[PDB]
Amino acid sequence: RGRIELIIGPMFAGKTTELMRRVKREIHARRSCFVIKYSKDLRAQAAVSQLTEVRDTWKRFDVLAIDEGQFFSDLVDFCNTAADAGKVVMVSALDGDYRRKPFGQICELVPYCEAVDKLTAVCMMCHEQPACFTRRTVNVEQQELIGGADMYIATCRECYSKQQ
Amino acid sequence: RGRIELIIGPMFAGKTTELMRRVKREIHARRSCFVIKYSKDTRYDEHNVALMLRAQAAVSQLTEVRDTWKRFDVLAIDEGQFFSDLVDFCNTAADAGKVVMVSALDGDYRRKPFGQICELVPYCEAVDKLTAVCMMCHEQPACFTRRTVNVEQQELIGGADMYIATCRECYSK
Amino acid sequence: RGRIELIIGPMFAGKTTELMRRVKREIHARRSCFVIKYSKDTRYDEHNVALMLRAQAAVSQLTEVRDTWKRFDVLAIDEGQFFSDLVDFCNTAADAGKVVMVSALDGDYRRKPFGQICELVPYCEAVDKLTAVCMMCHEQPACFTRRTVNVEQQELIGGADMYIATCRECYSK
Amino acid sequence: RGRIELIIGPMFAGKTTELMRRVKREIHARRSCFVIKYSKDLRAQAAVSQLTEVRDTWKRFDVLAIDEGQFFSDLVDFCNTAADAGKVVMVSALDGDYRRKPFGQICELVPYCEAVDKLTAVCMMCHEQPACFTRRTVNVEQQELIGGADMYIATCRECYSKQQ
Ligand SMILES: Cc1cn([C@H]2C[C@H](O)[C@@H](COP(=O)(O)OP(=O)(O)OP(=O)(O)OP(=O)(O)OP(=O)(O)OC[C@H]3O[C@@H](n4cnc5c(N)ncnc54)[C@H](O)[C@@H]3O)O2)c(=O)[nH]c1=O
Ligand SMILES: Cc1cn([C@H]2C[C@H](O)[C@@H](COP(=O)(O)OP(=O)(O)OP(=O)(O)OP(=O)(O)OP(=O)(O)OC[C@H]3O[C@@H](n4cnc5c(N)ncnc54)[C@H](O)[C@@H]3O)O2)c(=O)[nH]c1=O
Ligand SMILES: Cc1cn([C@H]2C[C@H](O)[C@@H](COP(=O)(O)OP(=O)(O)OP(=O)(O)OP(=O)(O)OP(=O)(O)OC[C@H]3O[C@@H](n4cnc5c(N)ncnc54)[C@H](O)[C@@H]3O)O2)c(=O)[nH]c1=O
Ligand SMILES: Cc1cn([C@H]2C[C@H](O)[C@@H](COP(=O)(O)OP(=O)(O)OP(=O)(O)OP(=O)(O)OP(=O)(O)OC[C@H]3O[C@@H](n4cnc5c(N)ncnc54)[C@H](O)[C@@H]3O)O2)c(=O)[nH]c1=O
Ligand SMILES: [Zn+2]
Ligand SMILES: [Zn+2]
Ligand SMILES: [Zn+2]
Ligand SMILES: [Zn+2]
């Protein structure tokens, strides 16, 4: 029946690719899938900034796939409500922000998950080690800052701490 | 090389057994291990009977161990949910090159974050969530712990007399 | 450092997608990747439309690639069950320091070992078996592939017209 | 219902400990377990050299746990027969012998398994790397040779190939 599965890791770890692998796998067995994306960064897709913007539309689907779950403030209630109604809920997210603080409600969701898979990146500094962290490479304080390789890199533990 | 590995799941999932599997594996390669346990959980000792590269300590605060961890290659912290200084302690060790391994419940009986376990996740190179077998329906994996006695507080020491592991359907029933 | 990683499972499990996730991850760290595909499986190309550190080759024997693999950090072999020289090729590369990653069916439609996949297992640093969703009962994970047309031979190219992924109960029914 | 789960890896990887963790987990949910061991190296234990020596006794148990599965010549038929009758079958074994050849029927079982978990040891030569292989440290040819750390060590790939 219902469950919540979490796919976490740093940036550049292919978390969305693993989410969509799980989605495609379900589509092959003719189960219907609703993919929800973050608007500011047998298949339907929606882009929103709050999960309430989707209303009741999720009820018609067997599987819900939430991408970049760190940005949704109502994630926990939304996922449990769906999983309680028998949906397979899958979330892709960063567990940590650039300071390794809990990003959004991701760490809060952990106790509700039937499964949690932490994916690694490859360290983009030493090229020699798995990366579990994200370092911000530009001097901006704010937690939410949208960007890719131009402003963030994945790092191992030794390279995260190099300099500051 | 320094790292933190987290072993989580509900009660009855064999988390300590997995922690000690990782410890025995390191001992075979002659790396030294420091096992730290929570002194107030006395179930094992009060109803059960008694290596060269292994040390064991039982404490209620991780500061009670001071610097002794520095002499060991590997630190293995059991029932990590009960230690308030877990995050700072694990990072300080991992940054000094220790392999830190923690066994803990991620969730309490209400599925609220237990201690600093959920806070540690962003610091971990690895996170393995283990399942139990649901002790109500017997036919589903269990990811949650239900408290079977009517006590509100979060810390309450006990085993199968006071808790059972459950699937999602049986947690809410 | 050299290694072999094996990605197995039944059909419809997204094995190639996981292989390419591992490839894209390496490309982000500017390590170069050589993707090798089986030339006779033309399903993707015959019904579908068309990076700097990536190369792709389509062959029926791994010798058709000669030495070209030596210039790459990572080798990604897709549908490995069809290559007869897989074991020797993967070890030679891994021993020369390549990260070798193979996606393959471990079992054919009779659950017999497909090609040299089962033979490779003892050489692998890692083995991940992926599940599909059972295409018969829709409510169980699938670990097997059933052939839905009456053909005996082992190699028979096709997709969902000719095969479905099944749980254990639905494989035998 | 029925399934076959395989726990493989080199020596010194704690494979039997992971097998027994799965057994203990089942016992907590009052499911009954039959542990079968290799005689030459809610719970019952048997030590045998052939799985036929157990006859029909396995039928009374919910869960079967076969240790050192590499030594049983009838493993595949035995596991499928049980899993087909609705047993949870769990096997702990070496997938490779000291030359990295398939040990017994372990590699043959893979296509029948719902799950396969390969555990690592820590390399007992360089102490610095995970070990996936077993090296024999005494000059004996024969495949079956019972022993522990006195005659075998776990190694990474680089240390397996050191010298010969
Ligand atoms: C550290 C930090 C980050 N962020 C911001 C910066 C970023 O804008 C975003 C990353 O958040 P995420 O890591 O959850 O987002 P994803 O991009 O989903 O993470 P991935 O691991 O998926 O990224 P990769 O770079 O590995 O993805 P890759 O596959 O290499 O890149 C292709 C791009 O296309 C998308 N994509 C990939 N496969 C797709 C598919 N099958 N269908 C649809 N879209 C797909 C991906 O989302 C990615 O952006 O959040 C902050 O605001 N604060 C912070 O402190
Ligand atoms: C849900 C909830 C629980 N609790 C309390 C209740 C308990 O006092 C404690 C459990 O915390 P845990 O689940 O982190 O503790 P463990 O017992 O470590 O978890 P396990 O997953 O290991 O438990 P099992 O019951 O599966 O362990 P098992 O092997 O069955 O039992 C034997 C006991 O012996 C120890 N043990 C087992 N194998 C061992 C080995 N190889 N070496 C040394 N010791 C070993 C284990 O610690 C276990 O408690 O926390 C709360 O206070 N509030 C709550 O909301
Ligand atoms: C059981 C059996 C099968 N076969 C034959 C039938 C087939 O011809 C082939 C399947 O062999 P595979 O299962 O190893 O082949 P894949 O297609 O590689 O397995 P997947 O698990 O990847 O299949 P999916 O169906 O889940 O893949 P999907 O994503 O759904 O489909 C899209 C196709 O595009 C490719 N693709 C998917 N993502 C891609 C990406 N990111 N980049 C490049 N290519 C990508 C994939 O190869 C897939 O075939 O072998 C036999 O000959 N005998 C037998 O007994
Ligand atoms: C490479 C090679 C090996 N062998 C032989 C040599 C050996 O005699 C045997 C190892 O075969 P295995 O690796 O399947 O056997 P296990 O010992 O089951 O492997 P483990 O990974 O479990 O061993 P470890 O050394 O990590 O186990 P450890 O936990 O450190 O050691 C304690 C011992 O007690 C047993 N044990 C451990 N936990 C137990 C529990 N909970 N209940 C009962 N017994 C338990 C274990 O089997 C081990 O022998 O096979 C060959 O004949 N030919 C070869 O080419
Ligand atoms: Zn690095
Ligand atoms: Zn249940
Ligand atoms: Zn089915
Ligand atoms: Zn080594």
Q: Give the closest residue to A124 by CA, choosing from A111, A134, A139, A114.
A: A134
Long-range contacts for C63-69 (Cβ within 8 Å, ≥24 apart)? C65/C36, C68/C34, C69/C34, C69/C93, C69/C98
Same domain, D35 and D106: yes
Q: Which residues contact A62 (CB under 8 A, 6 or more apart)?
A: A26, A31, A32, A33, A87, A88
Q: Which is nearest to C166 in space by CA: C152, C145, C151?
A: C145
Same domain assignment for residues D108 and D159: no
| DSSP for residue C101 | E
Of C104, C50, C96, whose CA–CA distance to C77 is shortest? C104
The residue annotated as part of the active site, out of A18, A68, A114, A144, is A68
Q: How many domains does chain C have?
A: 2
Pick the closest to residue D123 from D2, D5, D11 (CA basis): D11
Rounded-to-integer distance, Cα C79 and Cα C57, Å: 13
Backbone φ and ψ of A51, nearest 5°: -75, -20
- Who's near D139: CB < 8 A, 6+ residues apart? none
Query: In whole angstroms, what is the distance from residue A6 CA to residue A116 CA?
Result: 5
User: Within the 3-22 window of chain B, which residues sit less than 8 Å (CB to CB) from chain D?
Assistant: 12-14, 17-18, 20-22
- Structure determined via: X-ray
Same domain, A124 and A112: no
* B138 and B118 fall within a common domain: no
Residue C18 phi, psi dihedral angles, 5° rounding: -70, -40
Complete DSSP assignment for B49-72: ---TTEEEEEESSGGGGTTGGGG-
**For residue C164, which amino acid is it?**
I
- Please tell me if the CB atom of residue A41 comes closer than 6 angstroms to any atom of ligand 1: yes
Which subunits have 3 or more CB–CB pairs within 8 Å of chain B? A, D
**CA separation for the pair C68, C75 (Å, rounded):** 11
Residues whose CB is less than 8 angstroms from the CB of residue B137 and which lie 6 or more positions away in sequence, other chains included: B167, B169, B170
A141 contacts: CB under 8 Å, gap ≥ 6: none
Residues of C catalogued as catalytic: 79
Judge contact between B146 and B164, C-beta under 8 A.
yes
CATH at B119: 3.40.50.300
B18 catalytic per annotation: no
Smallest-distance ligand from the CA of C115: 3
Q: How many beta carbons lie within 10 A of that of residue D8, not counting itself?
A: 29
User: Is the same domain home to C173 and C109?
Assistant: no
Q: Are residues C103 and C151 in the same domain?
A: no
Can you tell me the distance from the alpha carbon of C34 to that of D80, in angstroms, rounded to the nearest whole number?
A: 39
Question: Is residue C153 within 8 Å of residue C37, measured between CB atoms?
Answer: no
Domain residue limits at D131: 120-164
Say if residue C37 is in the same domain as residue C81.
yes
Query: Quick one: tokens of B131?
Result: 């399942």
Q: How far is residue B167's CA from residue C54's CA, in Å, rounded to a whole number?
A: 44
Query: Could you give the CA distance from residue A69 to residue A104 in angstroms, rounded to a whole number?
Result: 8
Of D58, D35, D62, the C-alpha closest to D47 is: D35
B105 and B149 assigned to the same domain: no
Size of interface A-B (CB pairs under 8 A): 79
Resolution (Å) of this entry: 2.4
What is the β-pairing status of strands D3-8 and A130-131?
unpaired
Q: If you measure CA to CA, which chain B residue comes closest to D120?
A: B25
- Which residue among C17, C26, C142 places its CB closest to the CB of A21? C17
D26: which 2 tokens? 């089942």
Atom 53 in ligand 4: which residue has the minimum CA distance? D144
D152 annotated to a ligand binding site: yes
- The two three-digit tokens of residue B8, written as one number: 């989580």
- Which of D18, D26, D68, D158 does the annotation list as catalytic? D68
Indicate if B123 and B150 belong to the same structural domain.
Answer: no
Question: Is the distance from CB of C139 to CB of C147 less than 8 angstroms?
Answer: no
- Where residue D104 falls (left for φ over 0; alpha for ψ -120 to 50; beta otherwise) is left
Whether residue A5 contacts residue A115, with contact meaning beta carbons closer than 8 Å, is answered with yes
Question: Which CATH number is D146's domain given?
Answer: 3.30.60.20
**CA distances (Å), origin B13, targets B121, B131, B160, D28:** 19, 5, 12, 9
Residue A134 in contact with ligand 1 by CB distance below 6 A: yes
For ligand 2, residues with CB inside 6 Å are B 11-17, 20, 41, 44, 78-79, 103-105, 108-109, 145, 154-158, 163; D 24
Here the tokens at position C84 are 């007869």
**A102 in the same domain as A145:** no
Q: Which of C53, C35, C52 is nearest to C44 (CA)?
A: C35
Give the β-pairing of D133-136 and D130-131. Answer: unpaired
| D70 CA to centre of ligand 1 in angstroms | 44
**B137: nearest CA partner in chain D:** D29
Kindly give the distance from the C-alpha atom of residue B143 to the centroid of ligand 6, in angstroms, as a whole number: 10
Query: Residue C141 pairs with which residues in a beta bridge?
Result: C133
- Please check whether residue B52 touches D, CB under 8 A: no
Q: Could you give the CA distance from residue A45 to residue A66 in angstroms, rounded to a whole number?
A: 10
D72/D134 same-domain check: no
β-bridge partners, D141: none
> Cα separation of C103 and C92, whole Å?
18
CA distance B35 to B99: 12
3-class secondary-structure state, position A121 = strand
Ramachandran region, residue A107 (left: φ > 0; alpha: ψ -120 to 50; beta: rest)? alpha
CA C103/CA C77 separation, integer angstroms: 6
In our burial notation (b when 16+ CB lie closer than 10 A, e otherwise), range B67-93 reads eebeebbbbbbbbbbbbeebbebbbeb
Sequence-distant (6+) residues with CB within 8 A of C134 are A29, C140, C141, C142, C165, C166, C167, C170
Do C30 and C98 reside in the same domain of the chain? yes
List all residues 6 or more positions away from B126 whose beta carbon is below 8 Å from its beta carbon. A118, A132, B3, B4, B5, B6
From residue C169, how far is each of A155, B93, B170, C172 by CA, in Å? 44, 49, 25, 6
Cα distances (angstroms) measured from residue A157 to each of B3, D20, D162: 7, 33, 30
Q: Which partners does chain A have (≥3 C-beta pairs < 8 Å)?
A: B, C
The token pair that represents C8 in the structure block: 């197995």
Q: Does C171 touch chain D (CB under 8 A)?
A: no
